[PDB]
Design an enzyme around this catalytic site. Structure first.
Site, PDB file in Angstrom:
ATOM      1  CB  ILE A  74      -0.948  -0.021   1.214  1.00 54.56           C
ATOM      2  CG1 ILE A  74      -0.171   0.105   2.525  1.00 54.56           C
ATOM      3  CG2 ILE A  74      -1.813  -1.273   1.171  1.00 54.56           C
ATOM      4  CD1 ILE A  74      -1.027   0.163   3.752  1.00 54.56           C
ATOM      5  N   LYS A  95       5.069   2.954  -0.824  1.00 48.69           N
ATOM      6  CA  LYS A  95       6.401   2.825  -1.396  1.00 48.69           C
ATOM      7  C   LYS A  95       7.036   4.211  -1.451  1.00 48.69           C
ATOM      8  N   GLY A  96       7.920   4.493  -0.492  1.00 49.66           N
ATOM      9  CA  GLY A  96       8.575   5.789  -0.427  1.00 49.66           C
ATOM     10  C   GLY A  96       9.623   5.837   0.677  1.00 49.66           C
ATOM     11  N   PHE A 154      13.064   4.936   2.139  1.00 49.69           N
ATOM     12  CA  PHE A 154      13.760   3.666   2.008  1.00 49.69           C
ATOM     13  C   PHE A 154      12.872   2.536   2.532  1.00 49.69           C
ATOM     14  CB  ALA A 155       9.991   2.558   4.123  1.00 51.67           C
ATOM     15  CB  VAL A 156       7.939  -1.414   0.703  1.00 51.30           C
ATOM     16  CG1 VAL A 156       6.674  -1.916   0.025  1.00 51.30           C
ATOM     17  CG2 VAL A 156       8.965  -0.997  -0.341  1.00 51.30           C
ATOM     18  CG  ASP A 199       5.549  16.471   8.690  1.00 49.06           C
ATOM     19  OD1 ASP A 199       5.550  17.436   7.898  1.00 49.06           O
ATOM     20  OD2 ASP A 199       5.407  15.263   8.352  1.00 49.06           O
TER      21      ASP A 199
HETATM   22  C1  LIG Z   1      -0.322   6.325   1.369  1.00 44.97           C
HETATM   23  O1  LIG Z   1       1.033   6.034   1.658  1.00 44.97           O
HETATM   24  C2  LIG Z   1       1.004   5.406   2.881  1.00 44.97           C
HETATM   25  C3  LIG Z   1       1.070   4.028   2.915  1.00 44.97           C
HETATM   26  C4  LIG Z   1       1.039   3.374   4.117  1.00 44.97           C
HETATM   27  C5  LIG Z   1       0.951   4.151   5.264  1.00 44.97           C
HETATM   28  N1  LIG Z   1       0.921   3.530   6.526  1.00 44.97           N
HETATM   29  C6  LIG Z   1       2.070   3.595   7.305  1.00 44.97           C
HETATM   30  O2  LIG Z   1       3.158   3.860   6.828  1.00 44.97           O
HETATM   31  N2  LIG Z   1       1.944   3.341   8.638  1.00 44.97           N
HETATM   32  C7  LIG Z   1       3.123   3.246   9.395  1.00 44.97           C
HETATM   33  C8  LIG Z   1       3.680   1.997   9.581  1.00 44.97           C
HETATM   34  C9  LIG Z   1       3.070   0.759   8.995  1.00 44.97           C
HETATM   35  C10 LIG Z   1       4.830   1.897  10.339  1.00 44.97           C
HETATM   36  C11 LIG Z   1       5.418   3.014  10.899  1.00 44.97           C
HETATM   37  C12 LIG Z   1       4.860   4.253  10.715  1.00 44.97           C
HETATM   38  C13 LIG Z   1       3.705   4.367   9.962  1.00 44.97           C
HETATM   39  C14 LIG Z   1       3.135   5.745   9.783  1.00 44.97           C
HETATM   40  C15 LIG Z   1      -0.338   3.029   6.956  1.00 44.97           C
HETATM   41  C16 LIG Z   1      -1.435   3.161   6.121  1.00 44.97           C
HETATM   42  C17 LIG Z   1      -2.639   2.677   6.573  1.00 44.97           C
HETATM   43  N3  LIG Z   1      -3.824   2.776   5.805  1.00 44.97           N
HETATM   44  C18 LIG Z   1      -3.855   3.037   4.454  1.00 44.97           C
HETATM   45  C19 LIG Z   1      -4.438   2.122   3.602  1.00 44.97           C
HETATM   46  C20 LIG Z   1      -4.457   2.434   2.248  1.00 44.97           C
HETATM   47  C21 LIG Z   1      -3.925   3.606   1.740  1.00 44.97           C
HETATM   48  N4  LIG Z   1      -3.972   3.945   0.349  1.00 44.97           N
HETATM   49  C22 LIG Z   1      -4.827   3.010  -0.371  1.00 44.97           C
HETATM   50  C23 LIG Z   1      -5.280   3.689  -1.648  1.00 44.97           C
HETATM   51  N5  LIG Z   1      -4.135   4.305  -2.300  1.00 44.97           N
HETATM   52  C24 LIG Z   1      -4.236   3.895  -3.692  1.00 44.97           C
HETATM   53  C25 LIG Z   1      -2.878   3.770  -1.775  1.00 44.97           C
HETATM   54  C26 LIG Z   1      -2.694   4.151  -0.310  1.00 44.97           C
HETATM   55  C27 LIG Z   1      -3.358   4.505   2.616  1.00 44.97           C
HETATM   56  C28 LIG Z   1      -3.329   4.213   3.959  1.00 44.97           C
HETATM   57  N6  LIG Z   1      -2.735   2.091   7.764  1.00 44.97           N
HETATM   58  C29 LIG Z   1      -1.630   2.004   8.510  1.00 44.97           C
HETATM   59  N7  LIG Z   1      -0.435   2.462   8.164  1.00 44.97           N
HETATM   60  C30 LIG Z   1       0.899   5.529   5.230  1.00 44.97           C
HETATM   61  O3  LIG Z   1       0.811   6.191   6.466  1.00 44.97           O
HETATM   62  C31 LIG Z   1       0.783   7.597   6.257  1.00 44.97           C
HETATM   63  C32 LIG Z   1       0.921   6.189   4.015  1.00 44.97           C
END
Ligand SMILES: COc1ccc(N(C(=O)Nc2c(C)cccc2C)c2cc(Nc3ccc(N4CCN(C)CC4)cc3)ncn2)c(OC)c1
Length: 318
Positions: A11, A13-14, A16-18, A127
């Site tokens: 969900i 990709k940015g 150095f992380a996925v 932020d």
């Molecule tokens: C958008 O880029 C992202 C992608 C993922 C995360 N993410 C984390 O990085 N969490 C996290 C973790 C794991 C660890 C440490 C710190 C943090 C902050 C996260 C998202 C999440 N729900 C969610 C579902 C789907 C969508 N979209 C679906 C439709 N679009 C086409 C694609 C994206 C976005 C969010 N639930 C929990 N965590 C994120 O957080 C800002 C932004």
């Protein structure tokens, strides 16, 4: 599959992380796992990620993403969090446009509860942006990215200039030492504006243009924006940090108070205002799985965020 987790979607990709969606194979919980390659990471970036993770561990709150587990290999870091099944606010604004103030008030009250709680635990986010806010299945707010956050001592000045220029307070552009909360209160003003207006109060074709816009402190109130909403934002987006509303004043504003009653808001804000247990049936449920209750208690006492901590926490939030 990674430990007790089955990965079932990518969900994010940015940097150095996925980020992936996964299922905990014991508790059935949906989680997000962020996978960081340390072999990409610079030295200070590792010190950053380490502080980010430490701050996330301090924050258990209904409108803040909850960290459940840290896994670390020689090569990789894995961060397991609560999954926000509503996605990001960005995608919601692209889909549906500027929010009605009824919708904006619900969400902003939730944002404020989360930020107020950070401040009560001596954390500044530094932020806050609309677009990156997460939403649960009912489009309830969860605040994330704590990558620019820090501990603050009330009264102490901070001296790291950070965050996204559209949300950054003028004194950050100017390179001044700054009050942590007052920076967050400025950012909150821009986030509220974005939610209600679907556009930025300060913008520009270059960063130089944008910078001049922020320092000017002038922005457009659209015809559709209520007098009360206008007043709130104008009392947050003030150039002098000292003339900005407090968090306490923000919770009391008349824009907050109109509309449906809100016991949860007041309860959560009350809890954040305070100065000063083990679930036995969880421990027993875990023991009957095959997790020794001694190692579980050790994992809990040491704040390990390991296999046993995760399962304890995931069961308690169920
Ligand atoms: C958008 O880029 C992202 C992608 C993922 C995360 N993410 C984390 O990085 N969490 C996290 C973790 C794991 C660890 C440490 C710190 C943090 C902050 C996260 C998202 C999440 N729900 C969610 C579902 C789907 C969508 N979209 C679906 C439709 N679009 C086409 C694609 C994206 C976005 C969010 N639930 C929990 N965590 C994120 O957080 C800002 C932004």
């Amino acid at each position: 599959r990674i430990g007790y987790y089955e990965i079932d979607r990518t969900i994010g990709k940015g940097n150095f992380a996925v980020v992936k969606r996964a299922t905990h194979l014991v508790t059935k919980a949906k989680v997000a796992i962020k996978i960081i390659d340390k072999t990409q990471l610079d030295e200070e970036n590792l010190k950053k990620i380490f502080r980010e993770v430490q701050i996330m561990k301090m924050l258990s709150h209904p409108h803040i993403i909850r960290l459940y587990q840290v896994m670390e290999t020689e090569r990789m870091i894995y961060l397991v969090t609560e999954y926000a099944s509503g996605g990001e606010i960005f995608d919601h604004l692209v889909a549906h446009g500027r929010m009605a103030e009824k919708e904006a008030r619900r969400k902003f009250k939730q944002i404020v509860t989360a930020v107020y709680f950070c401040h009560s635990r001596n954390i500044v986010h530094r932020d806050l942006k609309a677009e990156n806010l997460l939403l649960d299945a009912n489009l309830n707010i969860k605040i994330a990215d704590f990558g620019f956050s820090n501990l603050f001592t009330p009264g102490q000045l901070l001296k790291t200039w950070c965050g996204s220029p559209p949300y950054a307070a003028p004194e950050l552009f100017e390179g001044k030492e700054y009050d942590g909360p007052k920076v967050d209160i400025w950012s909150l003003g821009v986030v509220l504006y974005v939610l209600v207006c679907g556009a930025l109060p300060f913008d520009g074709s270059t960063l130089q243009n944008l910078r001049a816009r922020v320092l000017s402190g002038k922005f457009r109130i659209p015809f559709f924006m209520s007098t009360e909403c206008e007043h709130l934002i104008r009392h947050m987006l003030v150039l002098d940090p000292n003339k900005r509303l407090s968090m306490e004043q923000i919770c009391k504003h008349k824009w907050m108070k109109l509309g449906d009653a809100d016991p949860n808001f007041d309860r959560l804000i009350a809890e954040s205002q305070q100065l000063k247990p083990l679930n036995e049936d969880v421990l027993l449920a875990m023991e009957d799985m095959g997790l020794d209750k001694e190692q579980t208690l050790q994992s809990l006492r040491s704040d390990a965020y390991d296999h046993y901590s995760a399962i304890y926490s995931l069961l308690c939030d169920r």
